[PDB]
Amino acid sequence: AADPNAPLKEGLKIAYLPKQLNNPYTDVEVGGGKVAVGEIKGEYKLVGPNDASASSQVSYINTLIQQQQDVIVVAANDPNAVCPSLNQARKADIKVVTFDSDAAKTCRDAFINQATTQGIGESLVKMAKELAGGSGEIAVLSATPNATNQNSWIEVMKTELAKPENAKLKLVKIAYGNDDDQKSFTEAQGLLQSYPNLKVIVSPTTVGIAAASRYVSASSYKGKVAITGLGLPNQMRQYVKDGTVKKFALWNPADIGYLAAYAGAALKSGQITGAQGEKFKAGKLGEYTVGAAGEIVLGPPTEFTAANIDQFNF
Fold it and tell me: Partners of 175 in the beta sheet?
């Protein structure tokens, strides 16, 4: 019973509960929510544990319920631990939008996903293919062997590589840097020594791509091997500006928070319910169509280059 013509309500109380307060990435993320909330003339609130807090997310959700927020935007640390309190909120007609990390499907109205695993894996292979000039060896520098996210992205990369059009690209090795600066550095060195014909190292970890770039930048492989992957714009800027890295991907965290506010407002205003195929407007981000199980995908990964790297600060 979505009414696309229902007006977005003013004065909505929209609260954000990230995984951890007070880090640059998270600040940019919820800061985007603050902008969107101001646009729709709502009231913005930020709560959450800090670095040396041992408080559960449940304690914060319960607080937001008692404060009678209209929308709770939350990055769930555990998909199920938050369910009882989130569903208590929804029983009180509070709309619940997860972001970054999702809760069990039955404990929120919508999930803002910054990029799908398909999107990420496609982008990694697409960038690798361009940098390799259409053919040649590539290697992955990953996080830990059991890393859930990287393992998903790598599986998508493999499915992509198995397509007829990517037949000339060969994945020769996956190395693990364990999201550790020094190990990632040494593993990058190891890849280049072991595979003299290597064209691209793809590192789908912010730690890993920075460490590989730092190695390549100060080695004899500068200009001779490409480095791409998933990186943080501020950490990667010096390597983009010095020519070591031409292209890499991630997403704009501010848009995640911004999109979450509009989705939450659309839910609370009756424009959408979270059913697949429903459409709504999200300000500067344009029109969105809700996907399966209430997932709303921000878009394909954002590509960073010298042409646009100063446009972002995180």
Answer: 141
Tell me the structure's resolution in angstroms, rounded to a single decimal.
1.7
CA 212, CA 145: separation in Å to the nearest integer? 18
DSSP state of 101: B
Strands 279-281 and 287-289: antiparallel
Angle (nearest 5°) at CA 146 between 141 and 150: 45
Q: On the CB side of 247, how many CA atoms lie within 13 Å of its CA? A: 14
Residues 6 or more apart whose CB falls under 8 angstroms from that of 11 comprise 41, 42, 43
Q: Which residues contact 209 (CB under 8 A, 6 or more apart)?
A: 141, 203, 227, 228, 229, 230, 231, 236, 245, 248
In angstroms, the Cα distances linking 111 to 13, 108, 290 are 19, 7, 9
Q: How was this structure determined?
A: X-ray
Beta bridge partners of 203: 229
Provide the CA 46 distance to its chain's centre, in angstroms. Answer: 20
Q: Cα(221)–Cα(109) distance, rounded to whole angstroms?
A: 49
Q: Where are the domains of the chain?
A: 1-113+252-298, 114-251+299-314
The topology (CATH level 3) of 1-113+252-298 is Rossmann fold (3.40.50)
Contact (CB, 8 A) for 221 and 192: yes
Residue type, 59: S
Q: Which CATH architecture has domain 114-251+299-314?
A: 3-Layer(aba) Sandwich (3.40)
Name the H helices within 114-205.
117-131, 148-161, 181-194
Beta-bridge mates of residue 205: none
Exposed, middle or buried, 218 (CB in 10 Å: 0-12/13-18/19+)?
Answer: exposed
270/284 Cα distance (integer angstroms): 20
Whether 1-113+252-298 shares its CATH topology with 114-251+299-314 is answered: yes
